[PDB]
Amino acid sequence: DWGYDDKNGPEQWSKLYPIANGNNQSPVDIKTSETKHDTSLKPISVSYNPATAKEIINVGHSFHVNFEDNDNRSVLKGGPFSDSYRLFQFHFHWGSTNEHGSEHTVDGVKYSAELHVAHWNSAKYSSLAEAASKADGLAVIGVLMKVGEANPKLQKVLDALQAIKTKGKRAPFTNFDPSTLLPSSLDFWTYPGSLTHPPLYESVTWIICKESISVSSEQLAQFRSLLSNVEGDNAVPMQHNNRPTQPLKGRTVRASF
Numbered sequence: 001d002w003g004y005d006d007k008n009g010p011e012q013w014s015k016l017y018p019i020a021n022g023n024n025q026s027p028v029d030i031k032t033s034e035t036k037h038d039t040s041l042k043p044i045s046v047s048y049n050p051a052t053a054k055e056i057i058n059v060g061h062s063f064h065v066n067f068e069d070n071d072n073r074s075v076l077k078g079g080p081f082s083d084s085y086r087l088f089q090f091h092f093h094w095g096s097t098n099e100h101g102s103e104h105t106v107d108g109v110k111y112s113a114e115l116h117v118a119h120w121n122s123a124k125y126s127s128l129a130e131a132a133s134k135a136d137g138l139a140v141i142g143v144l145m146k147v148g149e150a151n152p153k154l155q156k157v158l159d160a161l162q163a164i165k166t167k168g169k170r171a172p173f174t175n176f177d178p179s180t181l182l183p184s185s186l187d188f189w190t191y192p193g194s195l196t197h198p199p200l201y202e203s204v205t206w207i208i209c210k211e212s213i214s215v216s217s218e219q220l221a222q223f224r225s226l227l228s229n230v231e232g233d234n235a236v237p238m239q240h241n242n243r244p245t246q247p248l249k250g251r252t253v254r255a256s257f
């Protein structure tokens, strides 16, 4: 029902999701002259088990890679967190051209895409459903993707898209550690925010990597060739799924560096 087209897009989400106009909405423009270095931030620690990788799904507006989350095989710790967060999913956002596509921006610069690695607070809550609406419920790592050299670490993900071309298609997607997609440096910014699409819950502690990762023009073309329509309908390419940046409304972006 909600989407990214003119009628059902970001500008219209506030009609059924009034939190769209809230005080902790994501994404944001990170102004580096306004970040506050925080001495208490610990290094980010990711430990993911490739056997937790489950399924790749065409969800119409995007594609998701889902992980088994019945236990602490795949966790995020450190950074601003006291709690351990359990991996559940990673996905991407992209734009209609190389010029835009990231959700977060840095000093107003727009990258070509962004990787989200999402986790839920299994220290406090017993399920993703319980965690998702809680202020301390979710932790998402964002990595800005800069158009340039082809990124070989995307190969398994890109190779899998031919089997989920249309909306609702899904396939097994196994034996994959998404920490291989992260940049060498885990230097980061953090700020309290939200899911970047409906239902836009203000439940996310964002970890934005300072270092970008690469993606080629042709790798981005593979994302944009995914189809939003169900099989047999006329083809409607997934051209974009990035939400514009939202007002900080007095929030502080902290730097680990």
Ligand SMILES: Cc1ccc(SCCC(=O)Oc2ccc(S(N)(=O)=O)cc2)cc1
Binding pocket: 116, 118, 128, 132, 138, 140, 194, 195, 196, 197, 198, 199, 204
């Ligand atoms: C109908 C319904 C009800 C609850 C939710 S909430 C749990 C899934 C979630 O958390 O899904 C997302 C995770 C990360 C991001 S993002 N782009 O990284 O902010 C978005 C959705 C979703 C749909």
Ligand SMILES: [Zn+2]
Binding pocket: 091, 092, 093, 116, 196
């Ligand atoms: Zn996302």
